[PDB]
Amino acid sequence: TLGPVVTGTSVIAIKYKHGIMIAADRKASYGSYAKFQNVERIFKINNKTVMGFSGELADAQYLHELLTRKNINNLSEKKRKEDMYTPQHYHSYVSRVFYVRKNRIDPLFNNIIIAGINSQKYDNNDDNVLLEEYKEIHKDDLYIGFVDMHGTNFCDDYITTGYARYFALTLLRDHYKDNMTEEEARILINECLRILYFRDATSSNFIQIVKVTSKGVEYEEPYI
Amino acid sequence: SAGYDLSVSTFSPDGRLYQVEYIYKSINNNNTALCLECKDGIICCCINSNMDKNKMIKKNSYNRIYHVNNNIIITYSGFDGDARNIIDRARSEANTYYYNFHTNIPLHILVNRISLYIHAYTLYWHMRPFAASIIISSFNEKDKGDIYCIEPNGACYKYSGIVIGKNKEMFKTEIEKKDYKDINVRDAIEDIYKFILTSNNLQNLVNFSWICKESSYEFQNIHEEILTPALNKA
Amino acid sequence: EYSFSLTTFSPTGKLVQIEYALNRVSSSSPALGIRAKNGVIIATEKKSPNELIEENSIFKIQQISEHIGIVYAGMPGDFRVLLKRARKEAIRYSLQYGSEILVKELVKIIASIVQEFTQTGGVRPFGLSLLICGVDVYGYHLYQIDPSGCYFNWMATCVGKDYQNNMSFLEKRYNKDIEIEDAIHTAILTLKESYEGVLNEKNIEIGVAYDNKPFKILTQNEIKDYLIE
Amino acid sequence: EYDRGVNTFSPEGRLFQVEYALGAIKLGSTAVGICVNDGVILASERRISSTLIEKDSVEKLLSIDDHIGCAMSGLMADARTLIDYARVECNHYKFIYNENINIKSCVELISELALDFSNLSDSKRKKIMSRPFGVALLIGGVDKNGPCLWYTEPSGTNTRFSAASIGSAQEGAELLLQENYKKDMTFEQAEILALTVLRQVMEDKLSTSNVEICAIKKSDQTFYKYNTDDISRIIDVLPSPVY
Amino acid sequence: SYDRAITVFSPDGHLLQVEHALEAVKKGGCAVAIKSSNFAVLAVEKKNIPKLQNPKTTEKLIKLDEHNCLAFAGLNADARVLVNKTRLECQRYYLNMDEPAPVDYIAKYVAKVQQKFTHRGGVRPFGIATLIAGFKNNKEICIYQTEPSGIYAAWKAQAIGKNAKIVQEFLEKNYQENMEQKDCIFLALKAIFEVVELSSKNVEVALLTEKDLTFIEEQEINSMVELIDQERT
Amino acid sequence: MYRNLYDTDNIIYSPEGRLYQVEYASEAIKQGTCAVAIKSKDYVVVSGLKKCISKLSFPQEKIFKIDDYIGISMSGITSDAKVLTKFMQNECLSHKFLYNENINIESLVRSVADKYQKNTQKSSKRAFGVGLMIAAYHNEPCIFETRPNGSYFEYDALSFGARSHASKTYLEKNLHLFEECSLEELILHCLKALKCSLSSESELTISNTALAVVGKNHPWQEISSLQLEEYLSKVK
Amino acid sequence: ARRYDSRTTTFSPEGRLYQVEYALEAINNASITIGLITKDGVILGADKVFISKLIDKANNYEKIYKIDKHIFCGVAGLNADANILINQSRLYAQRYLYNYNEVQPVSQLVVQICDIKQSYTQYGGLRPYGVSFLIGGYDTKDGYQLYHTDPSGNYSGWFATAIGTNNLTASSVLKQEWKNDMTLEEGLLLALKTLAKSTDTEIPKSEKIELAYLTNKDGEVYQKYLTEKEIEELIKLYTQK
Amino acid sequence: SMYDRHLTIFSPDGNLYQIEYAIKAVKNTNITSVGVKGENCAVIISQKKMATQYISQDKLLDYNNITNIYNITDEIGCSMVGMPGDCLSMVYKARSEASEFLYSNGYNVNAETLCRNICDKIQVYTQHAYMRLHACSGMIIGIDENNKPELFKFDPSGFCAGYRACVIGNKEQESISVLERLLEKRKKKIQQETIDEDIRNTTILAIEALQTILAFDLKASEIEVAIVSTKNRNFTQISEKEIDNYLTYIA
C-alpha cells in the first residue's frame, strides 16, 4: 500500500504460567478521528497461536487471509498431533513475507506480533475451525514473536508494540515477574492500558483481552 | 474399432470414446470405496485388498480418506498417484475461493470445478487422462448431506450411497436392503462390517472416517475405540 | 511435437490434402457470382431440409463492409471463422486509411490467411471456397478464393457442386457488356434448369451492388419479380 | 528409431536410446588411465594415419582445468561439447568458491548433462539436448583427498576406477590392467604400466608420434602433457618386451 | 518436426541422420586446399552451363574476413546460412576481443555450429563439409576442415567433395613442405584427377597471403593447364 | 493384451487397464542391487549392498544423505536418482532457510512423490524409474518408499528387487524388530537380510555394504570401515 | 502422438531430401516462365495457364509480379506458396530502403528470400515452399541481372532461363538463338520465339503469355504489357521469325 | 500411410470422419430433447432420464440433481446432450463468454450472438489437431433486444443454424416429420388473438411433441421443462406441481 490511512492502536502480549495474554482496544482511527470503534485486532490463526495487528488495518486483513489459509492447508495433512504448525513456524513465515516486501517498494505497514504455545505435549488432536482446568508451561514453550515493517524479528517474554512500546513497556520491564498468576496478569495489563488511555490520541476503552491457555483460545471484553 | 483406441483425442467409428472405457476397467481392479448417507451424518469406508501381500505397513498408514477443509471429504478408487493431483487441485480450489470470497466453498460448486479439471485432460491429445474416480461428500447443519461422485471424463452425479471399485456391483446389493437414510451413524459402524466379510479376511485394513455425528459437524478420525467392538459374527 | 504440417507433398507433385479439400467444395451448394457493367451479382441456392429453419437466420451472403459482399460454398463452420477475420482486416485497413477497403487489398489478405493453414503445423486447410464481390473505385470486381490459397480475377463463375456443366451456361449466355437487371435473369436460369432440384422459390439468396449503391441483399419478395421470368 | 521415441522404457527395464548409444563408445581410439597413491597418469593413441594432418590439432587428452585432465572415447564431436561444458562449470566454480573443484563433483555435472530428457530445473533449459551423448570420459585429477580417477558412460553410471581403459580396445586392455596393476606404485611404475598395456592392444608401434600420454603430479597439482622429450625416454625403457 | 529428436541413434550405434548428411557431401562440387610456408593456395571445382552464368555468383571460395578464406563442398543452398552464421561471429570476435578472428577460432566455431545442429531438437543436420584456410594469432597459416559430423582438424593439404579419396591419395605422395608460390599452384592444379575435364572453365584457384586474398586470372591459368596434359604423356 | 500397440507412450492405456510404459520403469528397480531398512522403537538403520562393475573399480555409493536426519538409498538407474537426490536436498535446505524448524518427513515425501506424478501425465517426459528408500527421524522414526507412480507406504522393513523374494520372507516372520531396543542387535538383523539374500558363490560383506544409522539422538551417521567389519560383519 | 509425423526435414538414405525433390518436380508441371537479359534491359516471359474463358485476361495476370520499382519476378510453380513469398520479398525490398536510404540491389534480395526457403527445409518441421521464380532487376553497381531461385534455396545468376514445364526444349532455343548483345525489340521476339516452341504451337493465341521489361532510362520505368501491345509483337513474330 | 482417425485429415471423398464419428456420440446417449418457439415465448423440454453411456446403476442416485437444462445467463438458458463430460464444459465455456460480453459490451448478450460465439470456438477444435472434438450438441434459448423469442441449436461441428422448433438427440432423422405436423396445429388453427397463453399454447403443444417420439407415459418425476416467457424473461423452469397438471391434457 502507500500511507497508513486507517491507523490502529497497539497490543500488549505477556506470558505467564497458564499461557499467553494478549490484549488490545477495539478502536481504529481513520486519520484524526475514531471512525470505527468496534473492530477486533487479535486474530486467531490456529487453535494454539494468535496474532495481533498494529498500524494499518486494511493491510492487516491481507496478512490474516494469508495465514488462515496456511492453517487449513496444515490441517489437511494432520495425520498426527505433532504435525501442527508451531508458532515459531508462523513467526518465521511472517518475517519472511515482510522481508520479501522490504526488497520491493510496498512494505505492508504493520507491527505483527505472533504469540502462542510452542509445544505439543497437550491433547488437541481434534481441530474444529467453526463452533477443564489450566496447566503449567515451562516458560520455554511459550513463544511470543514480533515483526516490524522493516522485517525485524525477535522474541521475548513480553512483547509490546506501537505506541505502548514507550509507555506500557517501561512499566512492564520492571514489574513483570516470572510465572505470574492469572489475576496478576490482567491486573498489570489493565493498569498499563490505563496509562495508554490518558497519554495517546488514537486509543480508547473496549479492551479485548485474549488469553491463550493450555485448553484453547478465549475472548473477553472489559471496560477498565 | 482397430487403431482408433490408441489415443484419447480420437473418436471410435461407433460413436464410443475409446481410451476412457479402458480407464473404468483399471479402477475396477483396484481397491473399492464406500460412502453412504445416514440420518445423522455421512460415513465413508475404504476397503483395501491389495495390501494383503505387503504385510509390513502400519495398521493405519495407507489412508485414502482425504479432506479439503473442516467438513468435506474426498476418497479415491483406482490410481492413488493420479488422484492425489486432483486432491491438491481441490485444496487449491478451496483456498482460491477463500481468498476471493472469505467463505467456505459450497459442495455444489466444488464438484463442478473438479469435474472440469478431470475432463480437461480428456480433451487434449498429448496428455494422459486421470484413472481414478472421486467421491466427494459433506453434511450441512440445516440442509441434509449429499454424496457426489466424479467418475473419469466428468459426469458428476449426486448420490445417497455409492460403492465404486473392484466390487461396485457386489456391495451395492447390500446397501439396497435397508433404507440407510433413516437409521443412524453409529449403527452403521458395525453394519458395513457385515458386508466386507461376506464379499477379505479378519484384518484391520479398512480405514474409515465420518463427517458428522453431532460432534461439531466436522471431519473426524477413524476413532480406534469405536472400531474395536466389531460384530465379527452377525 | 504438436506442430507439424499434415498437408505434406506427394510423389506425383501435388498436395493431396488440398485436392481432398476441393472434393468438399465440389459436393456443396452451388454459389454463382456474375459481374456486370453497372454492378456485381452474387447468387446462391439455399437448400431447405425442412420448414423449421428460419430463412432469415442462416445465410450464404454476408457483408464484409458497406460495399464488399462475400459468398461461400463448402463447410459452414469454416466460413464464420473466415468471415470474422475478413471483417477484422477490413477494419484495420479502415483504421489506418480513412477510405474503404479495396477488393484487391482484401482478397490478398484473406488469401494469405487461407494459405497459412496449408503450411501451419497442426491444422487442416479451409474446406470452402469464397466469392468476394464489391464496388471499388477502380471498377467492379469479383474474386474467388480457392482453398489452396490462390485467387482468380473472375468475371462470372460458379463454385459449388456441378461447377463444370453449370459453368458452361456463362460460356455462351454472357457478353462483355451486360446490365445489372439482365444479370439477374441469367443467374436464376443457372440455378433453375441447370439442376433438377424443385421449383426454386424462397430458397435463392441474391446479392447486388446497384451501381455504387451500398451492398443490398435481396429479400424473398424482391426476388419474386425476377423468379416469375 | 521406428516410432519409439527417445524416452521409452524396454520390457527388461532399461531405456532404448541409452543402450542404443552405449555401442558407440567402443569405436574411437583406445585410452588408459591409472590412479596410484603417488599420482594419476593418462594415456591414449595418436591415430594420424593420414600423413597430411598436422598431428597437433587432434588430441585425445584434453584438459578441464589445471587439476582435472580427461580423455575421450566414442564420438569425438560430442566429446568437445561435454568438455566445453565441463571447462565452464569447473571454471565457474573457481569464481564462486576460491578452491578448485573436486573430481567427484565435476563428474556429477557432466553426468547430469548426458540425461537431459527428464530434468525439470534451470541451467540446462536454454538448450535441451535431444539425444544422449555418445562419449565415455576418463576424468582424473588431484583435487583433494588424494588423486582420483572417474569414468563416465552415456547411461550416467559414473564408477570410480582405480585403473580403467576406454576406446575400441576397452575389452582387450582390461585383462592386462586387472592382473598387472599393483596397489603401491610410483610414477615410473605407472608410466611403464601405461605403455605396456598400450603395446599389446595396438596395430602399430609405440613410437614418439603414436602415443601422447599426460600426467598430473600430486605435489604441484598441475597437469602437464608429456612432450617429445619425456615420451622418448619412457618408450625406450621397455620393461616387458613379449611377443 | 518441432522440438523433436531428428538425429537419433541407430540400433547398432551409429548416427543414421549424420551418416546420410555425410553422404550428401559425396554428391557435390569438389575442392582442395594446400598450406605452404607463408601462404595457402585454394582450389575449387565448378560446373555451369556455357553461354550462361558468367560471374558464377561466387559459389565457393568465400571470404570471411581480410585473411580468412573458406571453401565448402556439398549442399550449396546450405552455404548461405553456414557462412552468414560464421561471418557474423567473425565480426563479433573483432568487436569483443578487438583482434581479427584467427582461423583457430573460426574453425572451432563452424564445428560448434555444425555439432549444435546434430544435437538440437527439430533441426536437420548441416549437409555441408567445409575447409577454412586462414591465419592463426601469430603469422601462422593453418588449413582446417570441418566434416558434417562436427569434428574438425588441421591439415597440411586436404581435398573434399565428390570422391575425396582418390584426390586425397594423390596429394599424399608429391606434397613438399615449403613449396614455391608458382610451384604450389602447380600441385593444386594437378588435382584434376577427379573431374575428367581439362578445361580452365571448371577449376577456380586463389592465393591467400599478406592478409589479402588475391584470385587467379584466366590468362595464367591457361598456361598452367597447358602443362597438365603434356605431363600425362 | 498387447505389447506392440499400447506400449510406445506414457499416454496409451492397455485394454485391461494397465499402463505398460510406467510398469516397464517399475521393473527397472528390480534390476539394481538390494537395500534393506529396519525400523526399531527409537532407531532406523539402512543397509545397502553396493556393486562392483570390475575388480579394479570401486563399489559405487548406494546410501546418500539429504539432511541432518533424512537419508535415502536409491534402487535402479542412478542418473534419475541424482535428480531426485538433488531435489530432496534442496527441499530440506529451503525449509531451514524460509523457516527454522526441520522439514516434515511426511511433507517432504509428499513433494518428491508428486515429482513422479508430474512425469507420468505428459507425453514428452518419462517416468522416473527408481525406488527411493526414504528413512528419517523427525519426531517418530519413519521409513517411506516411493514407486514410479505416486505412492507412500510407511513401511517397517523392505528390500529392493535384487533378491527381494528371499529378503521379504525373512522380515515377514520377524516381528521382534520393534522391541529390539539395542542398536547393536538391530544392525545385525539388518545385515542378516543381506546375508540371506545374496547370490551364490559370492562374498558376504567385504567392506562393500553401506550401512547408516539414524535415530533419536543419532544424526545421519555413516558407519566407517573400522566399525562394521570388526564385529558387525563378523558375527556369522 | 508422434506417429502422424511425415518427417519433412529428414534426409534420405541416398543423401538427398524427399520434400525438396517432391516440390522440385511439383513446379515442373506448372506454367513456364521465360527469362531474358538484353542490352537495353531485362525481359521476363510467362505463360497464362488456361482455366476458362471467363478470366479477365486484360487488367491483371498471376504470373509476373512487382517487388519494387527496379525488381520484378515471374512466379513458376504453386501460386499459393508464391504470394506469401512475394509479400515477404516486398518487405525485404523496403526494409533495405528504410535501413540504408538506397535501393536494394537484386543480388541481395535473392539472398534475403532464398534464406526463407532454406530455413523451411532446415527446422520447424513444415513443408517447403513449392515455388521458384525468375527474379531479376537492375542495380547501380552491375547493371541488369536475372536470378533463378529454387525450392531448396540454391539460387544462381543467369542470362536466359526458361523454368517451369518443358524446360529441356525451351532451354535449347535460348542456348543457340540468344546473342551476346541484343536490343530490346530483337530481344522481345526471342522470348516470344522460345515460348511458342515450348507449348508445341507455332504462334501465340494473344490471350496467352504475358511479358514485361525494365529498360532503365535512368529512372527504372518498368513498363508491363497489355493485350493490344502483344498484337504488335505477334505480328513481328509471324513476319520473319 | 492413410489415417482417417485424425481430427484434421480430409477423407478422399472430401469429408471429416472425426465429425461424423462425434455426431454419433450424441445419438449414442439417446437423450432426446425438444425445443419449440411460439408467440413471445419459447420452451425447451429435456428427457432427464439418464445418459446412455458407461454403467449407471440406478435406485440410489438423486433424480432431482440429474438434469440437462443449464442456464447460461439469467435470461439465456440452454439444454445440453451427448457426452456428460463435454456437456458441463460447454456450459462453462458459454458462461465464460456471456460474462465476458457484459464486461465488454454493456448490455446483456443476445441469444444469437452467444450461439455464434459458441460455434466460433467449436471450430478451433475442428481445425486444430491439438484438441479433441466436443461431442455435445445443444439448444440455446432466449429473448432478444427487439422483444422477440429466439431459439438456436448448435451441433458438434460448425452449425449456428437456429430453428423455430427443433429436436436434438438420437431421433433427429424422424422427429422432424412429427414436429412440423404438430406445429401446423397452431399456425392453421383458430389464432384469434394472443392473450399471453404461452404456458397453454406452446408448452401444451411441446410436451405432446415429446409424447410422439418417446412412446412412454412421460412420468412427471422424470421430465422437466423451462420457459423464457415474456413478462418474466428469466428462463423460468416449471415446477413438479405443474408438469403433471399439463400431462393430463391428453383429452
Cβ contact A–H (≥3 pairs, < 8 Å):
no
Instruction: Find, among G5, G12, G66, the residue nearest to G210 by Cα.
Output: G66
Chains in contact with G, where contact requires at least 3 CB pairs less than 8 Å apart: B, C, D, E, F, H
D3 interaction partners in chain F (CB closer than 8 Å): 8
Which cell is F27 given?
521393473
Instruction: Find, among A15, A42, A41, A47, the residue nearest to A143 by Cα.
Output: A15
Say how far apart CA H90 and CA G133 lie, in whole Å.
49
Nearest to B3 among H5, H21, H89 (CB): H5
In chain C, domain spans: 1-229
Amino acid sitting at position C229:
E
Write out the H or E segment, with its range, that includes residue D111. helix D103-113
Encode chain A in three state secondary structure: CCCCCEEECCCEEEECCCCEEEECECCEEECCEEEECCCCCEEECCCCEEEECCEECCCHHHHHHHHHHHHHHHHCCCCCHHHCCCHHHHHHHHHHHHHHHHHCCCCCCCCCEEEEECCCCCCCCCCCCCCCCCCCCCCCCEEEEEECCCCCEEECCCEECCCHHHHHHHHHCCCCCCCCCHHHHHHHHHHHHHHHHHCCCCCCCCECCEEEECCEECCCCCCC
Cβ contact E–G (≥3 pairs, < 8 Å):
yes
Give the number of C-alpha atoms closer than 13 A to the C-alpha of residue H114, restricted to the C-beta side.
36
C2 interaction partners in chain E (CB closer than 8 Å): 2
| Residue G185 sits at the chain E interface (C-beta within 8 Å) | no
C227 and C204 Cβ atoms separated by less than 8 Å = yes
Q: How many domains does chain B have?
A: 1
List strand residue ranges (DSSP E) for chain D, in order: 31-35, 39-43, 61-63, 69-71, 140-141, 148-151, 159-160, 163-166, 214-217, 223-225
G125 interaction partners in chain C (CB closer than 8 Å): 3-5, 121
Write b or e for each residue in C88-99: b if 16 or more Cβ atoms lie within 10 A of its Cβ, otherwise e: ebbeebeeeeee
φ and ψ of D129, to 5 deg: -70, 125
In chain E, domain spans: 1-233
E208 and E69 Cβ atoms separated by less than 8 Å = yes
In CATH terms, E1-233 corresponds, of 3.40.1690.10, 3.60.20.10, 1.10.1740.10, 2.30.29.30, to 3.60.20.10
Instruction: Find, among A94, A35, A33, the residue nearest to A63 by Cα.
Output: A94
Closest-CA residue of H relative to G6 is H1
By three-state DSSP, how is residue H248 classified? Answer: coil
**Which ranges constitute the DSSP H helices of H6-83?**
17-27
CB contact under 8 A, F12 and B6: yes
CB contact under 8 A, C54 and H163: yes
CB contact under 8 A, F98 and A83: no
Instruction: Find, among G59, G110, H84, G205, the residue nearest to C35 by Cα.
Output: G59
Resolution (A): 3.6
Say how far apart CA B34 and CA B47 lie, in whole Å.
8
Closest-CA residue of G relative to B128 is G1
Strands H165-168 and H224-227: unpaired
Write b or e for each residue in B181-197: b if 16 or more Cβ atoms lie within 10 A of its Cβ, otherwise e: eeeebeebbebbbebbe
Amino acid sitting at position H77:
G
D217 and D142 Cβ atoms separated by less than 8 Å = yes
Say how far apart CA H241 and CA C203 lie, in whole Å.
45
φ and ψ of F9, to 5 deg: 180, 155
F82 interaction partners in chain D (CB closer than 8 Å): 108, 111-112, 156
By three-state DSSP, how is residue H158 classified? Answer: coil
Say how far apart CA F94 and CA F97 lie, in whole Å.
5
Instruction: Find, among F172, H5, A157, G240, the residue nearest to B11 by Cα.
Output: H5
Torsion of CA B65, B68, B71, B76, to 10 degrees: -30
Instruction: Find, among B149, B136, B138, the residue nearest to B219 by Cα.
Output: B138
Instruction: Name, in order, each residue with C-beta under 8 angstroms of D211's C-beta and a sequence gap of 6 or more.
Output: D43, D44, D45, D46, D195, D198, D231, D235
Which cell is H11 given?
477423407
A139 and A155 Cβ atoms separated by less than 8 Å = no
H83 interaction partners in chain B (CB closer than 8 Å): 17, 153-154
CB contact under 8 A, G87 and C115: no
Say how far apart CA B226 and CA C1 lie, in whole Å.
56
First to last CA, chain G: 62
Which cell is F95 given?
525449509
Distances (CA, A) of E61 to E130, F65, G6: 10, 60, 36
Matching residue, cell 540504408: G100
Nearest to E57 among G7, G122, G157 (CB): G157
**Which ranges constitute the DSSP H helices of H128-219?**
175-187, 198-201, 204-213
Torsion of CA A41, A45, A48, A52, to 10 degrees: -30
Sorted by where each starts, the structural domains of chain H and their CATH numbers stand as 1-251 (3.60.20.10)
Chains in contact with B, where contact requires at least 3 CB pairs less than 8 Å apart: A, C, F, G, H
Say how far apart CA F119 and CA E51 lie, in whole Å.
64
Say how far apart CA C56 and CA G142 lie, in whole Å.
64
H132 interaction partners in chain B (CB closer than 8 Å): 8-11, 122-125
| Residue F61 sits at the chain G interface (C-beta within 8 Å) | no
* Structure-solving method: cryo-EM
| Strand order through the sheet with D61-63 | D61-63, D69-71, D140-141, D148-151, D159-160
CB contact under 8 A, A83 and F106: yes
D132 and D110 Cβ atoms separated by less than 8 Å = no
**Which ranges constitute the DSSP H helices of G56-165?**
80-100, 106-120
First to last CA, chain E: 56
H60 and H37 Cβ atoms separated by less than 8 Å = no
Amino acid sitting at position F156:
D
**CATH fold group of domain G1-241:** Glutamine Phosphoribosylpyrophosphate, subunit 1, domain 1 (3.60.20)
Say how far apart CA C223 and CA C206 lie, in whole Å.
8
What is D8-75 written as a DSSP string? -B-TTS-BHHHHHHGGGGGSS--EEEEE-SSEEEEE------STTB-SSS--SEEESSSS-EEE--S-
**CATH fold group of domain D1-243:** Glutamine Phosphoribosylpyrophosphate, subunit 1, domain 1 (3.60.20)
CATH superfamily of A1-224: Aminohydrolase, N-terminal nucleophile (Ntn) domain (3.60.20.10)
In CATH terms, C1-229 corresponds, of 3.60.20.10, 3.30.390.30, 3.100.10.20, 3.40.50.2300, to 3.60.20.10
Any idea what DSSP says for residue H143? E
B8 and B125 Cβ atoms separated by less than 8 Å = yes
Strands E31-35 and F209-215: unpaired
CB contact under 8 A, E77 and G160: no
Residues of A classed as catalytic: 1
Say how far apart CA C4 and CA C51 lie, in whole Å.
44
Matching residue, cell 572451432: E108
Say how far apart CA G49 and CA G198 lie, in whole Å.
13
Say how far apart CA E48 and CA E103 lie, in whole Å.
31
Closest-CA residue of F relative to D183 is F56
Matching residue, cell 548483345: G181
Most H-contacting residue of G2, G3, G4 (CB-CB within 10 A), to test interface: G4
Closest-CA residue of D relative to G7 is D3
Which cell is D22 given?
552405449
B119 and H85 Cβ atoms separated by less than 8 Å = yes
Say how far apart CA C74 and CA C159 lie, in whole Å.
9
CA distance E37 to chain D (A): 14
Instruction: Name, in order, each residue with C-beta under 8 angstroms of G141's C-beta and a sequence gap of 6 or more.
Output: G105
By three-state DSSP, how is residue D217 classified? Answer: strand
**Which ranges constitute the DSSP H helices of chain B?**
21-27, 82-101, 107-123, 168-175, 187-196, 224-227
Which cell is F223 given?
558407519
Say how far apart CA D60 and CA D31 lie, in whole Å.
8
Say how far apart CA F208 and CA F47 lie, in whole Å.
11
Helices (H) and strands (E) in chain F, counts: 5, 8
CA E165 to chain centre: 15
Q: Is the CA virtual torsion B214, B219, B225, B228 positive or negative?
A: positive
| Residue H136 sits at the chain B interface (C-beta within 8 Å) | no
E147 and E109 Cβ atoms separated by less than 8 Å = no
Write out the H or E segment, with its range, that includes residue G135. strand G131-138
Which cell is G131 given?
515455388
| Strand order through the sheet with G212-213 | G35-37, G42-44, G212-213, G223-224
What is B106-139 written as a DSSP string? PHHHHHHHHHHHHHHHHH-SSBPPP-EEEEEEE-
Say how far apart CA F66 and CA F70 lie, in whole Å.
5
Apex C133 CA angle, C130 and C136, nearest 5:
145
Cβ-in-10-Å burial (0-12, 13-18, 19+) of H193 comes to exposed
Instruction: Find, among C144, C225, C189, the residue nearest to C45 by Cα.
Output: C189
Which structural domain range is residue B153 located in?
1-234
CB contact under 8 A, E124 and G7: no
Q: Beta partners for A25?
A: A207
Write b or e for each residue in E114-138: b if 16 or more Cβ atoms lie within 10 A of its Cβ, otherwise e: bbebbbbbbbbbbbbbbbbbbbeee
CA H246 to chain centre: 21
Write out the H or E segment, with its range, that includes residue H150. strand H149-154
Instruction: Name, in order, each residue with C-beta under 8 angstroms of D95's C-beta and a sequence gap of 6 or more.
Output: none
Write out the H or E segment, with its range, that includes residue F86. helix F78-98
Rounded to the nearest 10 degrees, the angle between the axes of helix A60-75 and helix B82-101 is 150
Distances (CA, A) of E72 to A176, E110, E128, E195, E209: 90, 12, 7, 16, 20
B122 and A104 Cβ atoms separated by less than 8 Å = no
Any idea what DSSP says for residue B51? G
Instruction: Find, among H116, H46, H35, H44, the residue nearest to H81 by Cα.
Output: H46
F146 and F132 Cβ atoms separated by less than 8 Å = yes
CB contact under 8 A, E4 and G2: yes
Say how far apart CA A103 and CA F215 lie, in whole Å.
40
Closest-CA residue of B relative to F17 is B26
Q: Is the CA virtual torsion H190, H193, H195, H198 positive or negative?
A: positive
Instruction: Find, among G153, G154, G134, the residue nearest to G145 by Cα.
Output: G134
Sorted by where each starts, the structural domains of chain F and their CATH numbers stand as 1-236 (3.60.20.10)
Instruction: Name, in order, each residue with C-beta under 8 angstroms of E138's C-beta and a sequence gap of 6 or more.
Output: none
D100 and D94 Cβ atoms separated by less than 8 Å = yes
Instruction: Find, among A45, A77, A48, the residue nearest to A61 by Cα.
Output: A45
Strands G223-224 and H33-37: unpaired
C1 interaction partners in chain B (CB closer than 8 Å): 126
Which cell is B185 given?
451413524
Instruction: Find, among D32, D14, D8, D28, the residue nearest to D156 by Cα.
Output: D14
By three-state DSSP, how is residue H84 classified? Answer: helix
Instruction: Find, among F55, F80, F2, F36, the residue nearest to F195 by Cα.
Output: F36
Helices (H) and strands (E) in chain G, counts: 6, 9
Say how far apart CA B229 and CA B232 lie, in whole Å.
9
A78 interaction partners in chain B (CB closer than 8 Å): none
By three-state DSSP, how is residue G223 classified? Answer: strand
Distances (CA, A) of B116 to B155, C55, H54, H139, H245: 9, 37, 19, 21, 37
Which cell is B28 given?
475396477
Centre a 10 Å sphere on the Cβ of residue C115 and count the other Cβ atoms it contains.
26
Instruction: Name, in order, each residue with C-beta under 8 angstroms of A19's C-beta and a sequence gap of 6 or more.
Output: A117, A134, A137, A142, A211, A212, A213, A214
E95 and E101 Cβ atoms separated by less than 8 Å = no
CB contact under 8 A, C4 and E2: yes
Q: Beta partners for B158?
A: B148
Q: Is the CA virtual torsion B156, B157, B158, B164 positive or negative?
A: negative
Write out the H or E segment, with its range, that includes residue G239. helix G229-239
What is C69-137 written as a DSSP string? EEEEEE-SHHHHHHHHHHHHHHHHHHHHSSSPPPHHHHHHHHHHHHHHHHHSTTBPPP-EEEEEEEEET
Closest-CA residue of B relative to H58 is B159
| Chain gaps in chain H, named by the residue before each (C–N > 2.5 Å) | none
What is chain E written as a DSSP string? --S---S-B-SSSSBHHHHHHHHHTTSS--EEEEE-SS-EEEEEE----TTS-SSTT--S-EEEETTEEEEEEE-TTTHHHHHHHHHHHHHHHHHHSSSPPPHHHHHHHHHHHHHHHTTSSSB----EEEEEEEE-SSS-EEEEEE-TTS-EEEESEEEESTTTTHHHHHHTTS--SS--HHHHHHHHTT-TTSS----TTSEEEEEEETTEEEE--HHHHHHHHHHHHHHH-
Which cell is H162 given?
437456429
Give the number of C-alpha atoms closer than 13 A to the C-alpha of residue B197, restricted to the C-beta side.
13
Any idea what DSSP says for residue D134? -
Say how far apart CA H118 and CA H131 lie, in whole Å.
16
In chain A, domain spans: 1-224
Which cell is D155 given?
547411461
CB contact under 8 A, B125 and C2: yes
| Residue G53 sits at the chain D interface (C-beta within 8 Å) | no
